[PDB]
Amino acid sequence: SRRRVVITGMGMLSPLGLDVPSSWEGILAGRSGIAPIEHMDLSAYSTRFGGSVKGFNVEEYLSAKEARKLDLFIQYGLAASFQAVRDSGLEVTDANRERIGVSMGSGIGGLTNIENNCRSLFEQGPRRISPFFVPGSIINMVSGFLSIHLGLQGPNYALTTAQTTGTHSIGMAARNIAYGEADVMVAGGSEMAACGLGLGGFGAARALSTRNDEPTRASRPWDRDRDGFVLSDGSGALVLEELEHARARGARIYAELVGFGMSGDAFHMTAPPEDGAGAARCMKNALRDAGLDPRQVDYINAHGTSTPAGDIAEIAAVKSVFGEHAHALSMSSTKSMTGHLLGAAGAVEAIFSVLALRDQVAPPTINLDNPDEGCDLDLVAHEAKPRKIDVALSNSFGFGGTNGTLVFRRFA
């Protein structure tokens, strides 16, 4: 029968920090991680800024010899995973290594690497493609390389569900533990899509904010002057652990993961439905999975991408699910500060959701100067709000009409 799942370790790279604590300090202080991109010439692009990881030192984690072989998304994924495992205090042994797995996901994985090897192929020919190109670029190699370095012989896999990837990765890893397929899972996601193909591709779809002259104000979820999402890089990893296994070894437990929902919109390849029907189905699945009265929800970390259609869909979904209680809970988008980490958005946001529970504080939606038509909930505009939070919900939506919800609550 179904076992309980707790969070015993967390790790992160974000535009606000090279770990969880430094990232969280920025979240609570309403700091923006968004800046003109310096690694390349974006003068031909309609968007020239995003959320870069600043000062990442791969030699805190990996040999320069291994690092050279791996795309930044894999480097970021491993850094976050190592942080999480260290933070858990878990010791891997011959006694438990078959029961510890990994589910670290990505939207596109090694797009920089693919672009660079494409450049080689077109300018020089196939003989200049790296021998490390495939294992260094494909999405499942965070899971792969992590398992190799730590000796994890449990379930080893990777999700790719676009902007929903991190939430799905965490939820399904929890199910692995819940149903007895593993006792421990490292789960989350990593993204580094800030190359010509990523900024170009989202640019061609007009999905990105073009506020090049004021990048820290670009990401403004529910604000009437929003004009698309801000592209950001990084990684979130959590150590998920069966409750009795955590109690047995004396683990510090951050919070309990009580609920997971998925649903398909079955609406459109890229646009969410205006009424938030699929998002509402997903949150209800998750609240029923957690055995909760919806009025128990104190805080929602919204998907909150700063797109016109996405942001209003979410208000509509929240109003439909929570009715009058929609006015009592706090909902915020940390994407106001971090931008949109795509495959990693759900993973960093699950971590902010857990910290919202630890510190009893709703992070702000910065840049929310003029809430749009119908965006009349407590959206924690401008400044962090200390408040009672027993239950926190993290939403993600993505291309293909793919929805995820995670429900966390305090553990004592």
- Identity of the residue, 201 or 294, whose beta carbon is nearer to ligand X0G in the bound complex: 201
| 138 lies in the site for ligand X0G, by CB under 6 A | yes
Contact flag: residue 19 with a second copy (CB under 8 A): no
Residue nearer to ligand X0G on the CB measure, 232 or 353: 232
- Binding to a second copy by residue 196, rule CB under 8 A? yes
C-beta of 95 vs 269, nearer to a second copy? 269
> Angle between the 72-88 and 141-150 helix axes, to the nearest 10 degrees?
40
Choose among ligand X0G, a second copy, none what residue 97 binds, the Cβ cut-off being 5 to 8 Å by kind. Answer: a second copy
Partner from ligand X0G, a second copy, none binding residue 403, C-beta < 5-8 Å depending on class: a second copy
Query: Binding residues for ligand X0G, how many (CB under 6 A)?
Result: 18
Q: Work out what residue 216 binds among a second copy, ligand X0G, none; the CB cut-off runs from 5 to 8 Å by kind.
A: none
In the set 50, 228, 343, 364, which binds ligand X0G (CB under 6 A)?
343
Residue pair 47/210 in contact (Cβ under 8 Å)? The answer is yes
Q: How far apart are CA 386 and CA 28, in angstroms?
A: 10
What is the per-residue DSSP string for 223-256?
BTT--SB-BB-EEEEEEEEEHHHHHHHTPPP-EE
Is 3 an interacting residue with respect to a second copy (CB under 8 A)?
no
Q: Which of 278, 314, 321 is nearest to 296 (CA)?
A: 321
162 touching ligand X0G, by CB under 6 A = yes
Give the span between the Cα atoms of 341 and 332, in whole angstroms: 16
One residue of 92, 197, 271, 309 binding ligand X0G per CB under 6 A: 197
Q: Which residue has the tokens 């529910």?
A: 222
- Closer by beta carbon to ligand X0G, 136 or else 215: 136
* Cβ-based nearer residue to ligand X0G, 92 or 271: 271
145 contact, one of a second copy, ligand X0G, none, CB 5-8 Å limit per kind:
a second copy
Q: Mask 150-189, x = binds a second copy (CB under 8 A)?
A: xxxxxxxxxxxxx-x---x---x--x---x-x--------
Please give the Cα distance from 100 to 186 (Å, whole number): 8
Question: Three-state DSSP class for 121?
Answer: helix
CB-neighbour burial class of residue 222 (10 A; exposed 0-12, middle 13-18, buried 19+): buried
Instruction: Between 33 and 154, name the residue whose CB sits nearer to a second copy.
Output: 154
Residues 106 to 145: which contact a second copy by CB under 8 A? Answer: 107-109, 111, 114-115, 117-119, 121-123, 125-127, 129-135, 137-141, 143-145
- CA–CA–CA angle 129, 78, 33 (5° rounding): 95
Position 147 contacts a second copy (CB under 8 A): yes
Residues near 367 by beta carbon (within 8 Å), at least 6 away in sequence: 216, 217, 219, 220, 221, 223, 336
CA–CA dist 260, 238 (Å, integer)? 15
Q: Which of 141, 152, 258, 342 is in the footprint of ligand X0G by CB under 6 A?
A: 342
Tell me the C-alpha distance between 264 and 226, whole Å. 26
Sheet order of strands, 255-264 included: 156-157, 100-105, 184-191, 234-242, 5-13, 255-264, 402-409, 391-398, 299-301, 330-332
Q: Which residue lies nearer to ligand X0G by CB, 9 or 136?
A: 136
Q: Are 298 and 389 in contact (CB under 8 A)?
A: yes
SS (H, E, C) 293-350: CHHHCCEEECCCCCCHHHHHHHHHHHHHHHHHHHHCCEEECCHHHHCECHHHHHHHHH
**Is 271 an interacting residue with respect to ligand X0G (CB under 6 A)?**
no
- Does 404 bind ligand X0G (CB under 6 A)? Our answer is no
**101 contact, one of a second copy, ligand X0G, none, CB 5-8 Å limit per kind:** a second copy
> Is 30 one of the binding residues for a second copy (CB under 8 A)?
no
Site for a second copy in 208-267 (CB under 8 A): 262-267
Provide the mask over 263-282, with x wherever binding to a second copy is found by CB under 8 A and - wherever it is not: xxxxxxxx-------x--x-
Q: What, of a second copy, ligand X0G, none, does residue 400 touch, CB below 5 to 8 Å by kind?
A: a second copy
Shortest distance, CB of residue 93 to ligand X0G, whole angstroms? 30
The least CB distance from residue 264 to ligand X0G, in Å, is 15
Chain contacts with ligand X0G (rule: CB under 6 A):
107-108, 111, 114, 133-134, 137-138, 162-163, 193, 197-198, 201, 342-343, 398-399
